[PDB]
Amino acid sequence: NALKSDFDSLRDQITKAASNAKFNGVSIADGTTTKLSFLANSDGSAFTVTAKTL
Amino acid sequence: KLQDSLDAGVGNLVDADLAKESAKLQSLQTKQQLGVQALSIANQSSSSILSLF
């Protein structure tokens, strides 16, 4: 039972640590959105970066 | 670790690259000096016509 309580507190810490990782209201590891795009050149082409949920 | 990463992110968003600013300042002072010289040359342009009359 003690090892199971340790495992549960550990997985809860992973959930919190994965949830709080955001920048100016946007995150990539959160899983909220499939991808993020960023400007690459003057005419509006984007540097796509796909999300990797954690 | 999260506070460190977030402060580093805001610093990357806001901090100027000073090494560029120093060269920009040098070129701008040389430009202002040549501009004051050109302004003096423009101020002297009207003086010559006294010789005409």
Tokens of B20: 């560029």
Query: Exposed, middle or buried, A43 (CB in 10 Å: 0-12/13-18/19+)?
Result: exposed
Taking every pair of C-alpha atoms in chain B, what is the biggest distance, in angstroms? Answer: 82
What ranges in chain B are assigned the alpha helix state H?
2-14, 18-43
The three-state secondary structure class of A35 is strand
Backbone angles phi, psi at A39, to 5 degrees: -60, 135
Q: What is the resolution of this structure in A?
A: 2.8
Q: Are A27 and A21 in contact (CB under 8 A)?
A: yes
Instruction: State the structure-solving technique.
Output: cryo-EM
Nearest CA in chain B to A21: B2
The three-state secondary structure class of A5 is helix
Q: How far apart are CA A20 and CA A22, in angstroms?
A: 6
Q: How far apart are CA B2 and CA A16, in angstroms?
A: 12
Partners of A23 on chain B (C-beta within 8 Å) are 6, 9
CA nearest neighbour of B13 among B24, B21, B2, B5: B5
